[PDB]
Amino acid sequence: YSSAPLRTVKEVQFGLFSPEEVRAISVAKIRFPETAKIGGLNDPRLGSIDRNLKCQTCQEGMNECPGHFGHIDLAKPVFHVGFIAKIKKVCECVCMHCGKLLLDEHNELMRQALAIKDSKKRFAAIWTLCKTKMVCETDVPSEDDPTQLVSRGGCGNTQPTIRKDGLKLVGSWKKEPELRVLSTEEILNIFKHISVKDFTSLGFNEVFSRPEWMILTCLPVPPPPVRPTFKLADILKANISLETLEHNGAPHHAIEEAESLLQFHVATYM
């Protein structure tokens, strides 16, 4: 018997888990790939294999015990599998150096796009106009004259064309040309710099879905009820050998292989 008021669900608010909240709600920091004992970490206190007992955590169940969440701290950030296409599209709108939207209220047809009510219809339209923008323009025509220019904030720098190369995103700059994979850490910073206004324009929500959360820095680990496998074990093993490589300051290519090994696992998870 439970003390709590009984209710029905009236609303469901969808959103992305922030890294801070995943940390906020976990019952255990998790990071060694082993299940004697017990029960590294993992699986604490997550918990209750079967029966008795009785957590921790908590105090029932099994069968009463909900199951609880742990977290793994990812040595580097990684793309969320599901959002690469979005992540790419956002990059195609935001200036890739300074974070500013590539077109704004000064542009003829961007005003028409911004007015759109349904936030998927609007994102479509904004992306359509900006994937063309090949510069983060410092100054613009306005009305008026031209002659008279009008200034914005950013910045000058050229934009890349972005290609999907499996799980990596590839850049292409000029106006022969300069190729460069765009690293996760780099996009994570761009996204963090996009304004509340600019990312709302873009269909994100400042409370429930900031675009940076599309980039994972902190995996939620599901409890035994969710996995009554061991993919996490491999995600962990990749995560380990990536930390034990920075700790050894080993060459750029070595860090990168182990980074995309981790990417590979958080991705196929998932």
Q: Is 42 exposed, middle or buried (0-12, 13-18, 19+ CB in 10 A)?
A: buried
The DSSP code sequence of 55-97 is -SSS---SSS-----EEEEEEEEEE-GGGHHHHHHHHTTB-TT
For Zn ion, the closer of residues 25 and 250 by Cβ is 25
**10/247 with CB nearer other proteins:** 10
Does position 169 bind other proteins by CB under 8 A?
no
CB 194, CB 98: distance < 8 Å = no
Give the binding range for other proteins (CB under 8 A) out of 55-63, 125-133, 176-184, 243-251.
55-63
Q: Which stretch binds Zn ion (CB under 5 A): 129-137, 142-150, 195-203, 240-248?
A: 129-137
Q: How far is the CB of 176 from other proteins (least distance, A)?
A: 34
DSSP state letters, 251-270:
-HHHHHHHHHHHHHHHHS--
Containing H/E element for 173?
A: strand 168-173
- The binding track of 64-93 with respect to other proteins, each residue x by CB under 8 A or -, is --xxxx----------x-xx--x-------
Consult the annotation and say whether 155 binds a ligand.
yes
Tell whether residue 68 is among the known ligand binding residues.
yes
Neighbour tally for 217: CB within 10 Å = 20
Only segment of 17-25, 124-132, 189-197, 233-241 that touches other proteins (CB under 8 A) = 17-25
Q: Give the shortest CB-262-to-other proteins separation in angstroms.
A: 15
Residue 122 near residue 109 (C-beta atoms within 8 A): no
Q: Which of 143, 177, 144, 139 is nearest to 160 (CA)?
A: 177
Tokens of 90: 């956002």
Q: Does 134 bind Zn ion (CB under 5 A)?
A: no
Contacts for 44-49: CB closer than 8 Å, 24+ residues apart: 44/70, 46/70, 46/221, 46/223, 46/224, 47/223, 47/224, 48/224, 49/224
Q: Is 213 in the site for other proteins (CB under 8 A)?
A: yes
Measure CA 106 to chain center.
30
Annotated binding-site residue? 93: no
Between 136 and 198, whose beta carbon lies closer to other proteins? 198
Q: Given the structure tokens 């106009």, which residue do they identify?
A: 129
On whether the CB atoms of residues 102 and 136 are closer than 8 A, the answer is yes
Among 190, 214, 235, 242, binds other proteins (CB under 8 A): 214
Q: Is 22 in the site for other proteins (CB under 8 A)?
A: yes
Binders of Zn ion in range 55-94 (CB under 5 A) = 55, 57-58, 65
Residue 91 is assigned to a ligand binding site: no
In 3D space, the residue among 260, 89, 82, 269 whose CA is nearest the CA of residue 187 turns out to be: 89
Element (DSSP H or E) covering residue 245? helix 232-246
Contact residue for Zn ion among 136, 214, 219, 242 (CB under 5 A): 136
Q: Which residues make up the interface to other proteins (CB under 8 A)?
A: 2-17, 21-22, 24-25, 27, 57-60, 66-69, 80, 82-83, 86, 108, 115, 117, 119-120, 143-144, 203-205, 207-209, 211, 213-214, 216, 219-223, 225-226, 270
Q: Which residues make up the interface to Zn ion (CB under 5 A)?
A: 55, 57-58, 65, 95, 97-98, 100, 136, 154-155
Give the residue ranges of the annotated binding site: 55, 58, 65, 68, 95, 98, 136, 155
